[PDB]
Amino acid sequence: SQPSTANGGFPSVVVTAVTATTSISPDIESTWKGLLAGESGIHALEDEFVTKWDLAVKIGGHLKDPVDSHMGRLDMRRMSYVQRMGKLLGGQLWESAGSPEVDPDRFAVVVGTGLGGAERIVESYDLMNAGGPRKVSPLAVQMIMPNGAAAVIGLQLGARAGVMTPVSACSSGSEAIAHAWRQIVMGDADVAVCGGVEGPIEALPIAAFSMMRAMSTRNDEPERASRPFDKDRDGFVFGEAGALMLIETEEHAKARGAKPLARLLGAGITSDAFHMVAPAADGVRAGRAMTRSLELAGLSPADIDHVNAHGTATPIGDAAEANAIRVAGCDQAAVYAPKSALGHSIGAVGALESVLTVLTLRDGVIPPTLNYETPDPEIDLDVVAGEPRYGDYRYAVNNSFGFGGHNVALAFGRY
Amino acid sequence: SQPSTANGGFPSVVVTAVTATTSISPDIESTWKGLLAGESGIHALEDEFVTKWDLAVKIGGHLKDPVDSHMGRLDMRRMSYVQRMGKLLGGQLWESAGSPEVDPDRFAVVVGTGLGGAERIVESYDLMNAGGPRKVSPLAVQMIMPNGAAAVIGLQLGARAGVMTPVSACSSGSEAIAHAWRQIVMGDADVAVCGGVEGPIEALPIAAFSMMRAMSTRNDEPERASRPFDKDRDGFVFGEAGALMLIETEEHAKARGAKPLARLLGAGITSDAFHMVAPAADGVRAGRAMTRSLELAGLSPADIDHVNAHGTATPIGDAAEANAIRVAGCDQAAVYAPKSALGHSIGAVGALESVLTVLTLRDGVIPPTLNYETPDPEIDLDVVAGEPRYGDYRYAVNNSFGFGGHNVALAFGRY
Numbered sequence: 001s002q003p004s005t006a007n008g009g010f011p012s013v014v015v016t017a018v019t020a021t022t023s024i025s026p027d028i029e030s031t032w033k034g035l036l037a038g039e040s041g042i043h044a045l046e047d048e049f050v051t052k053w054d055l056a057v058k059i060g061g062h063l064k065d066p067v068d069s070h071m072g073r074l075d076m077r078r079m080s081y082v083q084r085m086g087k088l089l090g091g092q093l094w095e096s097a098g099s100p101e102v103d104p105d106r107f108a109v110v111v112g113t114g115l116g117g118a119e120r121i122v123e124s125y126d127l128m129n130a131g132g133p134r135k136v137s138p139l140a141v142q143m144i145m146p147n148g149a150a151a152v153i154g155l156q157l158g159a160r161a162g163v164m165t166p167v168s169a170c171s172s173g174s175e176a177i178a179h180a181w182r183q184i185v186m187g188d189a190d191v192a193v194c195g196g197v198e199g200p201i202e203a204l205p206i207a208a209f210s211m212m213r214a215m216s217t218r219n220d221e222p223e224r225a226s227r228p229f230d231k232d233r234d235g236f237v238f239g240e241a242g243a244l245m246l247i248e249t250e251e252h253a254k255a256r257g258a259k260p261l262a263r264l265l266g267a268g269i270t271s272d273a274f275h276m277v278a279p280a281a282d283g284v285r286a287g288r289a290m291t292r293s294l295e296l297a298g299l300s301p302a303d304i305d306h307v308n309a310h311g312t313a314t315p316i317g318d319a320a321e322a323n324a325i326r327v328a329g330c331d332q333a334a335v336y337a338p339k340s341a342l343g344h345s346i347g348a349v350g351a352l353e354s355v356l357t358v359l360t361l362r363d364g365v366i367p368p369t370l371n372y373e374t375p376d377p378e379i380d381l382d383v384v385a386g387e388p389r390y391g392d393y394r395y396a397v398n399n400s401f402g403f404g405g406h407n408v409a410l411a412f413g414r415y
Numbered sequence: 416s417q418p419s420t421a422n423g424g425f426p427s428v429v430v431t432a433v434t435a436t437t438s439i440s441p442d443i444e445s446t447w448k449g450l451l452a453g454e455s456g457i458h459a460l461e462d463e464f465v466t467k468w469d470l471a472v473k474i475g476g477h478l479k480d481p482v483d484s485h486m487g488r489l490d491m492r493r494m495s496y497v498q499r500m501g502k503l504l505g506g507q508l509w510e511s512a513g514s515p516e517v518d519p520d521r522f523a524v525v526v527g528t529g530l531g532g533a534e535r536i537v538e539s540y541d542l543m544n545a546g547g548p549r550k551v552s553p554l555a556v557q558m559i560m561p562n563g564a565a566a567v568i569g570l571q572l573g574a575r576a577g578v579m580t581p582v583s584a585c586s587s588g589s590e591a592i593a594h595a596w597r598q599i600v601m602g603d604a605d606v607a608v609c610g611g612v613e614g615p616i617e618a619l620p621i622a623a624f625s626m627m628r629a630m631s632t633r634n635d636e637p638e639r640a641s642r643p644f645d646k647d648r649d650g651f652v653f654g655e656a657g658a659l660m661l662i663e664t665e666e667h668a669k670a671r672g673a674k675p676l677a678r679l680l681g682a683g684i685t686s687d688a689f690h691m692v693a694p695a696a697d698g699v700r701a702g703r704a705m706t707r708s709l710e711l712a713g714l715s716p717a718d719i720d721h722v723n724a725h726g727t728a729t730p731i732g733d734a735a736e737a738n739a740i741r742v743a744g745c746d747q748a749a750v751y752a753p754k755s756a757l758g759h760s761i762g763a764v765g766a767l768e769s770v771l772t773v774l775t776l777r778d779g780v781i782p783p784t785l786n787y788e789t790p791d792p793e794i795d796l797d798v799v800a801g802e803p804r805y806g807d808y809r810y811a812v813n814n815s816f817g818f819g820g821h822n823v824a825l826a827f828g829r830y
């Protein structure tokens with residue numbers, strides 16, 4: 001037979017530490033407690049660009065604790081925003097892991113981003129227009145390339161078994177975890193830091209996605225705007241995030257006394273090849289990503305107790321994902337849509353949601369999907385709502401189905 | 416034992432078609448004939464930005480046949496440059512492959528880029544400054560994200576087993592081929608289109624890399640400027656490119672009557688974790704990427720007849736790579752540095768050089784490394800020079816060691 005995690009064909013891989021900054025909290029355990037309490041990170045946008053442009057969208061979730069409140073002048077001048085977020089989270093994660101001394105040559109970093117690794121280019125032009133090519137800093141190259149955040153974390157932590165950056169829009173953070181798992185199971189690494197980072201809420205992303213009719217404009221009730229799978233959903237809401245996890249072989253964790261939080265069992269990556277932004281309505285390739293993760297894990301659909309949905313709250317997105325979940329045989333799973341409370345953070349969100357899936361398995365509880373008040377007949381999923389559902393969750397799939405038809409599914413198990 | 420291509424642990428994977436556009440020609444076979452004839456694609460830059468800024472660097476290789484000479488108004492308004500290059504090359508490759516009808520669900524696309532997938536953001540701002548958020552096109556989102564080129568090719572050709580975009584600066588195109596090989600050998604796909612694309616030579620990249628002292632300023636003799644491994648080298652020269660190859664299982668090629676050009680045997684990805692732009696002087700992690708490709712291939716260093724060097728012509732870059740080649744045990748290999756003739760094209764160059772490595776194995780010939788006139792005692796490599804070297808090349812490694820310490824080595828075999 002082909003290798004699987006269950007049959008021992010792949011080494012056992014465990015999640016041993018997690019970190020995230022969100023619109024609810026800089027502390028992942030406090031984010032988690034808040035989600036369980038029904039808290040939302042989504043508020044009225046107070047930014048002056050809203051009134052300047054009279055934007056249709058006037059809501060979103062800025063980080064509770066801004067990254068740059070932790071950043072000095074040097075970091076502010078010599079790193080992009082996503083590089084600063086990466087440095088911050090990388091250091092926080094390493095400290096949560098008990099600052100372990102690992103073999104640099106068996107240590108990988110894989111960190112996705114979505115849009116915002118395209119920040120520092122304009123400023124370079126400006127320097128050049130005023131004073132010419134010699135007024136462009138010799139530091140420009142290290143700030144402008146889209147792999148900058150992963151590069152910073154790899155250099156910070158000393159990762160010499162590969163430093164990688166996948167870009168697949170919304171699924172970038174999940175895809176990063178996927179590739180880190182592959183790096184380990186193929187024998188290239190024993191430990192990896194992986195996840196995703198993304199820039200802050202800004203005017204142009206709001207305008208670009210608003211003009212696709214992708215975004216909620218329920219401005220009078222910000223905390224009620226994001227309604228994944230609900231009959232009355234009207235698009236997504238931006239909520240800032242960055243998230244990283246530490247994964248390693250079970251043997252590597254045991255050798256250093258690390259307590260695993262969960263198992264990372266398999267990962268499926270597929271594509272729709274359907275449309276440049278819209279998901280395929282039939283959910284067939286998305287569902288196949290789910291199935292692929294199960295194959296690699298050595299699980300059957302009936303094993304899947306829980307799906308952490310991509311669940312953006314767009315009309316067409318949630319409908320496609322319901323079809324996907326059915327195609328994969330997982331439509332009896334308990335479903336959570338964290339974007340209901342945390343909003344959408346393109347390249348970071350899949351990583352954040354992967355962290356949340358780990359916590360669900362660890363604690364045996366799924367927070368309520370906020371705003372889920374009227375089930376949609378065309379969805380027909382068991383969506384957790386009202387208050388947290390405590391349950392015997394043994395296995396879970398985290399879905400991330402990004403703009404462009406990039407489908408990533410990650411299979412996790414309780415440790 | 417652990418799986419290898421030689422021991423049958425991984426399926427046999429073959430290269431069945433190739434395409435590229437370069438500073439020498441739009442036709443890869445004509446590029447190849449030109450390289451063998453000692454031709455250089457590097458000339459005086461005639462662009463007005465040179466004189467406007469009085470740039471220190473006044474040389475480079477624009478594509479012989481500009482992409483946009485093949486592009487109509489619709490494509491010009493609705494795709495970024497790298498997306499247009501991708502569409503062009505994707506279609507050319509598919510036609511060279513005999514336009515095969517493959518199973519979409521076993522067909523992957525992996526396409527890297529370096530910088531230039533960050534083109535269309537400024538124009539979106541401008542539209543918004545003048546007429547507001549509703550003047551930003553609903554097409555903006557599909558043009559601004561760094562995965563846009565891979566997305567276009569996947570949609571064009573119908574690839575539903577994953578559409579991926581690695582970013583690792585100079586090694587992006589090689590890394591893409593690496594991940595495509597993994598996608599196949601792990602069982603996720605049977606066929607993949609892979610490689611890299613990059614934008615055109617522009618003022619800001621020139622200024623940014625010039626200010627690092629990374630670039631040659633031998634403006635009076637443009638064709639003589641790029642001197643990899645030569646004692647008198649003074650940095651790299653930009654030469655535009657994009658390149659794609661079609662790879663598939665040997666069984667898949669045989670079933671459809673495709674004639675393989677070469678075997679893709681293994682791929683190693685490591686990282687220096689040393690510095691944000693400079694390579695580690697000791698070449699140890701770079702060499703390890705080479706070694707890893709051999710392990711996966713099931714080859715020993717003594718099997719390696721040929722190394723297609725990363726060879727940028729920077730003082731510190733070439734020195735580090737010589738150390739790498741020694742560390743990997745491949746310092747008896749015949750070495751070629753195509754950047755001598757084709758220049759450096761960040762995200763595309765590794766893919767282009769992977770194509771060149773395939774042709775070397777197919778034809779049993781290595782073109783001369785241009786400008787290699789005075790060996791450097793600290794390099795001590797067998798560098799092909801003067802005229803093509805005809806040889807019994809059975810196995811070859813293509814090196815791509817990008818800014819940030821991203822090391823990719825690909826192991827190829829003669830078919």
Ligand code: NA
Pocket residue numbers: 308309310311350353354398399400
């Ligand atoms: Na999810």
Ligand code: NA
Pocket residue numbers: 723724725726765768769813814815
């Ligand atoms: Na090379």
